Amino acid sequence: NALKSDFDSLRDQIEKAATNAKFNGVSIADGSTTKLTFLANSDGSGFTVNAKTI
């Protein structure tokens, strides 16, 4: 029972640590969106970074 409760605590910890990792409201580790596109060229062409949910 003690080992199970330790396991459960650690799982809840993983969840908290994962959902708090936002910068400026946008994040690539929670799983909110599928990809983020940044500017890479003075004409609008983008640099694509896929989302890696953890």
Add this chain to the structure above:
Amino acid sequence: SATAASMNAVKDSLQRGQSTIDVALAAGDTITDLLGKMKEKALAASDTSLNTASF
């Protein structure tokens, strides 16, 4: 000599034309600077990683 007097009349109109074009050129320089800045703004806003409150 009447014709030389008429040339004296022509030169002022040429000068007035020059003046109007200078005013237009000044305004045009301002407009080109503004257009550059607008392109910068539009390019910055074309980003899809941007917050809802910066757009």
